[PDB]
Amino acid sequence: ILPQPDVRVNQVGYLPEGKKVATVVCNSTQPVKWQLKNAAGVVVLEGYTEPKGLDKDSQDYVHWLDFSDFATEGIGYYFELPTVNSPTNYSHPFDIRKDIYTQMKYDALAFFYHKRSGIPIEMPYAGGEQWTRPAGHIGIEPNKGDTNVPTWPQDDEYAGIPQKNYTKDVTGGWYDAGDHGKYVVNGGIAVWTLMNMYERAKIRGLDNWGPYRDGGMNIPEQNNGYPDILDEARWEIEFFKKMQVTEKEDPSIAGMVHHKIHDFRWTALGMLPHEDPQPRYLRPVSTAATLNFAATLAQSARLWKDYDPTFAADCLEKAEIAWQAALKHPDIYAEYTPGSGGPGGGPYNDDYVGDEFYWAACELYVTTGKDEYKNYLMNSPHYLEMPAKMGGEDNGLWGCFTWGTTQGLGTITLALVENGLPATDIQKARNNIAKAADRWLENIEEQGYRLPIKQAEDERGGYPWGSNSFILNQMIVMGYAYDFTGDSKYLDGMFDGISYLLGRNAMDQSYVTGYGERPLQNPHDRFWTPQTSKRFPAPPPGIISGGPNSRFEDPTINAAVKKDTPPQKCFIDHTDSWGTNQITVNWNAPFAWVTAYLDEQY
Template identity: 45%
Template sequence: MADGETSHPFEIGTDAYDQLRLDALNYFYLARSGIEIDAAIVGDEFARAAGHVSEAGGSATNQGDVAVPCQPADDPAQPYETPWTCDYTLDVTGGWYDAGDHGKYVVNGGIATAQLLQTYERTKSASSADRGALADGTLDVPEVDNGVPDVLDEARWELEFMQSMMVPDGEPLAGMVHHKIHDYGWTGLPLAPADDPKVRYLHRPSTAATLNLAASAAQGARLFAPYDADYAAELLVDARTAWDAALATPDLYAPAADGNDGGGPYNDDDVSDEFYWAAAELYITTGEDGFSDYLDAHADEATEAIGPAGFSWDSTGALAVMDLANVPNDYPGRADVRQALLDGADEIAAVQQAQSFGMAYAGADDGTFVWGSNSQVLNNMVVLGAAYDASGDRSHLDALLESADYLFGRNALNLSYVTGYGDVYSENQHSRWFAAQVNAELPHPPPGSVAGGPNSDRGTWDPVISSLYPDGCKPQFCYVDDIGSWSTNEITVNWNSALSWVASFLADQSVVQAAAPQAPVCEVEHIRHGTWPGGFNTQIWLRNVSDHTLAWDDLTWSWTADQTVTRQAWSADWSQQAADVTASSLSWNDEIRSGKRVTVGFVGNPGAFADAAPEQFWLDGAPCDTVESAQKGAGKGAGKDKAKSSGKG
């Protein structure tokens, strides 16, 4: 109780976010298009028939995505001075429904896919990560037990859709990516995807959509490489094709007027951030000088990418900065990028500290809470978490933890914006099939769905919120948990992807870690002694930096892509599962005296992708410090192989 007010009851526990990590990611299977949502996986409540699987024009009840044509040139809704169309159709079955309607948008799918991939990639390189939390068998997806982490399976569902949106070879704008596909005309509530009667069109390609594919496909290529080499190679080919197409057509923008016929416009006439993001992912995946040169020439993008207003689908530079800073890579300007991340996080933390409700967001420059303000809060929390991973700065962790309280109920409305979390929470988000408010036989949105949140920009309001506040409202009060309030209460894949990243990060921070992070007892130096085409020779020095004898069993790390330890290895029992390597102690080196070290080594194969040295090691599950090492007589290319000091732990 405070000032005469009594809060809602709440629980205190050490695992408050463990289930949310899974629920937030399980949302995406329920958002899938082109597949039956199986009751055996999700229960009868959320099961539904596959949506948009009929031939276009071939069903009286459902216009499918199997052979979708382009907008007709004589369509009166065409927003272009020169009408645009094409004479081909595309099979764009699959992907995720973006939000509460049946549209599928590449720019929303791109950032959402990237954040799911980031959520997984963080488990490979962050010192505080629970490395097995997102393994195969952890999510409610049909691909479970296929040997691939479930979150990658989920991301692939959208990646394949984005690939299918590419303009075919031989056509004008070949290699570019169609911006979106959606119904011709808005549908009402409720309406299951399988019952959608509207004709659907492909909308004109855009440079932004093309770069979204280039970036997310490049990122996906390195992550799928240890599991599906053929698909990884396919992704990288498409990423390169899209990059080249965007360079050839750098200013084809989606117009604002293309949003009045059944889908939002998602217009963006500044794609410098998307170019930087795509170049970063292509560099991290390939290590090629051309992409490094592009990053050098556009280094100002890093300093401009992060700020208190938050990043979003139309401002993606932060994705590049965070990955360049935290994913092992050899970019020469990496220290400056990391500093840009830390400086931006400091700005966000300062804003968070100044807020009465302690959230990492103060609105736009004029204090307006924008459409999807909760996603801006969440994406600022992502930046804070990435900065903590990069530096171990406790102020960034504290700002993130306190911002979570805002989302879960410490706000002006005393309301949790995440369905199923808290005693009072949003449950009537705008959706055509999670529509219990208008049809009791349908479900509410599933647990782990985040509402868009307060929106005080009256120029974007829907009739529901407008009728409640005809004279306006204070920013945090401009929200209503009503299915008709699409401007304050929608759900989208790119908002839930931010929640997924944050929930996974929070689940990794135990009470002990949050209260008093433990100093590592081990230090690792990774040394390349020589490289040659198709191979390299490595030693690892494992040093005991504690004041007592250290008994150890397993030293582990993860490669960035498809590197492997060969059978030529010594001083440990070696094993590798996909990208994860384990060196197990032998009877004669399983104890290390204080201040002393043991040495293990191996010959490795660099694989087909960039061969960055690992930067984070774990000893029996606890993180070690990693120290920078000079190379010992290494051959050509060895300058790219030294381990960088991560500052983690």
């Protein structure tokens, strides 16, 4: 077992240039001496600590150890505190080189090939023989799904609103997380995040770099003429298309998009996609899913126009058919359902879709330039909006957006792409984004472990489900700020956010698989779960954990830690802790956006 260094640092390392502040565990409030040592032991730098006191989220007495000035490349740098009488008066070995996120950006996007449904996971692409597996859900027993998935049984206690009895082929798409579900909601932001990082590379001019080019990713679409990152994105878009309801299926709601499709009931950990024996069904349909659809398909329409005109055009034509249907049924909300004992997939419920509408409008406007999308876009409560603090479940949480609080996603599209909105408004939008980043930049300075989020305002406070993802989305908006201003403070903010995710935290935990001295090793996943049975393999690298969640929303974290544990410590790296150690598409997408960004800024 690993001791836990008194000096918390990024367990992998730092880019030679930029803000660098470790966090020490020192009740000894009074500047204590430190000293950066190279692998050999020689003190290549030194100074004193900065007493910050009792940190509210971690219940730790801490000091900051700013060493931003230092920028000398090398392997094995480890801090120390000669005066301190602690058996752990130090930091894990780390690096200061240019290629910290060079490989990590690919690993992160590889997560999406791995979670692909309806296709075999084969060698080269898998990165290892042990991650190979049969296609998941292609109608071959024991699977009972996706080629002919019927609508949810009506007599079911959680059947949701009534549906007609029919079947669809909804093969393909990505698995959401540790489960075998496929959700349009949550899938929407995930896929928007990959296409957006691409569009950003294009407009800036580096779309001919890394994963943005044909042959940039170790996926089967390596040299098919299209940009690799979009091939992945299209995999999910192809699945969205199949989820849209047709005239022959149900006239009352044609053009609308089924909320999600998954197992009738929950299966246990320790299973591969093709082994899932559960009956498979289609959830009801929801304005939000219809709008995520309209939005990502519009975005897809303008990005694929140069490569595959036929595909790009059908995307747009479907996006509009969905936007239109959403106006006629603007208030069908996916309702809540238990997390255990009920439907075999998460609910992703939301009773507010104004933002979604705003989002779809922003994407449709920039793509079609039509008046109707412009009039909505502008006369909206969310016009040019960009939260720093949201506010159903997201109210008072801290962060710019989530799978359910979508305004902001659209706003980013307005602040980065063509469109003929008064150049004046575009300016506000870009300012709001920088404002938003400033607030978070503050949170970091008042935070002991320099993380951009503070506990929730929802009175219960603490860190929410998948907190880490909030830090991630924040880093994206920050990233744009450094684009619109050039003020390296926004970049240093990112440097703090990611440092937290990689080890400078109250758990001395690297929430990313395959990275750090204490890497994330037991995510809640049905395939990569060594703890369930040695039969299954440790997971691939570059996948991030949801992190701390002080709502004790799973048995394991309930039995593993006291009832009063500090929010930033409410975590356990155990495959059973689904509320604290799970992996998803809406978390690895933003984690990828961010790792890519940090690799270019270098």
